[PDB]
Design a protein around this ligand. Structure first.
Ligand SMILES: Cc1cc2nc3c(=O)[nH]c(=O)nc-3n(C[C@H](O)[C@H](O)[C@H](O)COP(=O)(O)O)c2cc1C
Ligand SMILES: Cc1cc2nc3c(=O)[nH]c(=O)nc-3n(C[C@H](O)[C@H](O)[C@H](O)COP(=O)(O)O)c2cc1C
Ligand SMILES: [Mg+2]
Ligand SMILES: [Mg+2]
Lengths: 350, 350
């Protein structure tokens, strides 16, 4: 058997009658499916436990994910190989805690609502990958560090200091957050994980055998930003939002890194520095994407590679041949320095 | 009136009798102090609400913080100007949920224990400053960005790539985490806040009028690392753990920066880049600490400043005079490059 626990947020106000109606329909359907569980609500938050045969549970959950009456659905626990039902007598027992007045339940409700409102804020400051590990039954704090081969992605905004000096502070933050959103959506879609922001910089990583995905993510980010620039409103700072991207590949250490006050589950190692140093080279080139020969040679698709004969990097060991992709995008460009100059001219006059 | 809500972890196993004994003593004392509230336990976690006159509540809480039977004490909510008591009839009502078998409380306990174990993990991946804001009644997600003058601190480990290549992965992570712990303890003690780790780098900040504290924190970190090196066990990698530190001062933007999957409450702006570029200069100098003339001139104490006549920075606007402190520490050094060479020689032979 399988058992799922999740929390969600009301998408709109729901009356007590509407909540009980959800419970009636849930009980009618779950009884036929040999599914049991409990559904609680407290001040605009749902909490549900569902248990039964795994195939059936998965299909019910996918239907629940399509219900427009809740949103921000977070799976807290996914238990497989469950032996005994927790709620064998309840096809779906509905407990509206807003309406409950029992004297012992009253303090429990206060603590549950305080902890829930804290948790739902902390979620936004937390990586989704952390929640996935917890839901699988593993405490991420006890994962031991390990050496692992990764593709490291590093990107930043071209001439970002100009934004910070020529725009209102609300608009500066809107631009950087738009950029971080674009990068995160595409990296995550390609199976990578964003691990760190610092200033206007993104650091992300992919599995070591996923160079094709790292390259595709990088090209798709550059195309998404081109579309965003061309379609932005008149006078919008997004019209001059440009990126550089560097990719490197190497053995890194993955694990919990930080202090007793705060840590992240992230990566350490030379490929992080190499990716950042390659990304900085894009400021002297017409190409917005550059990557090492190790990334190039690990790819399996027939990419339109171009060798950037020069390899004037610093801090490396045996230098490195550097490559890009030659497409209509990386080609139709007038190069950093010129772009930096235009960014200032444009932003001075918006 | 004031009302405090907090959670804590049992420091050792406590029996049901010991829990009820805490509740008896709490009830006896709180009744005399006109304090009311509730104390819950669930699988090795305490939850407490206390309410009453503010002075009295603060003193009771300080006594509770000294009790050796719990640890990891986190204030979830501090309410001031409370008008009505939540638990007027309970000097301290003790509810041991492990022992409760009520049929409606049974699902509530399961959800409370799932949410609590998630929250206590998320705490370690979260900044303490976030929890402080939440406890004061503010949702940090809704704080608007603002321009603000800050001192920015940036530090990294000298020749860190050597550690990652010559030591077992568990030992590499132990070293970096020791370094991040040392920095965090001292920065926080001096009123600053650590905001970002990336690789082996620390980024922190202080209020704009706290240059003295940023300088003191920097000197105290360098002295703590000297003590750590000299007292490390035979053959320990901590014997060759060295730091560089750069400090800059400028207007930055403070606010929520990130994606829909993940954000931090942090800072953006040119002082971040300047501090990192000053810290990199320490690799060409005997001095481990360097800072801008703006930091120097904002200090109020009679520091033993030394002007590093050269100011060969890059990327700046009108360059910058660069300073350090000349003490027995920054003086008794043989300079980067030489230090980098020694780090490799030592770590190759441990
Ligand atoms: C919080 C919440 C919990 C729900 N739980 C269940 C459930 O346990 N079983 C179920 O079949 N539907 C559940 N639903 C409803 C489904 O989302 C959907 O409305 C229903 O299954 C459609 O059934 P019908 O097509 O017969 O009307 C839930 C909905 C919400 C908002
Ligand atoms: C979880 C926990 C909650 C407590 N709550 C109270 C309280 O509400 N009021 C109080 O006076 N002591 C409380 N205490 C106890 C104090 O920490 C301390 O033991 C007690 O006040 C000492 O009183 P005594 O010196 O008369 O023995 C609590 C202890 C623990 C572990
Ligand atoms: Mg930039
Ligand atoms: Mg370093």
């Amino acid at each position: 058997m399988k058992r799922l626990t999740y929390i969600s947020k009301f998408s709109r106000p729901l009356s007590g009658d509407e909540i009980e109606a959800i419970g009636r329909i849930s009980s009618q359907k779950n009884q036929q499916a040999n599914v049991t569980g409990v559904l609680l609500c407290l001040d605009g938050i749902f909490f549900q436990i569902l248990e039964g045969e795994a195939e059936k549970i998965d299909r019910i959950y996918e239907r629940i994910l399509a219900d427009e009456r809740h949103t921000d659905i977070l799976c807290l626990k996914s238990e497989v190989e469950v032996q005994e039902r927790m709620f064998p007598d309840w096809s779906m027992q509905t407990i509206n805690l807003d309406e409950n007045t029992d004297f012992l339940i009253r303090p429990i409700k206060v603590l549950l609502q305080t902890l829930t409102e804290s948790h739902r804020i902390l979620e936004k400051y937390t990586q989704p990958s952390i929640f996935k590990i917890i839901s699988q039954g593993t405490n991420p704090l006890n994962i031991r560090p390990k050496a692992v081969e990764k593709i490291v992605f590093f990107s930043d905004i071209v001439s970002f200091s100009t934004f910070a000096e020529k725009l209102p502070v609300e608009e500066v933050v809107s631009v950087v957050n738009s950029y971080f959103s674009v990068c995160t959506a595409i990296i995550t879609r390609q199976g990578g994980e964003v691990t760190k922001f610092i200033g206007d910089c993104v650091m992300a990583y992919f599995d070591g055998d996923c160079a094709d995905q790292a390259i595709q993510a990088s090209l798709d980010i550059l195309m998404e930003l081109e579309i965003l620039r061309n379609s932005a409103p008149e006078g919008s700072p997004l019209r001059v939002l440009y990126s550089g991207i560097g990719l490197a590949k190497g053995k890194v250490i993955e694990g919990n890194i930080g202090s007793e006050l705060k840590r992240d589950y992230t990566i350490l190692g030379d490929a992080v520095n190499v990716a950042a140093r390659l990304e900085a080279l894009t400021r002297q080139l017409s190409q917005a994407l550059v990557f090492s020969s190790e990334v190039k040679n690990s790819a399996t698709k027939s990419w339109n590679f171009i060798w950037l004969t020069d390899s004037e990097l610093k801090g490396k060991s045996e230098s490195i041949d550097i490559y890009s992709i030659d497409n209509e995008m990386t080609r139709k460009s007038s190069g950093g320095l010129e772009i930096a100059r235009n960014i200032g001219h444009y932003l001075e006059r918006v």
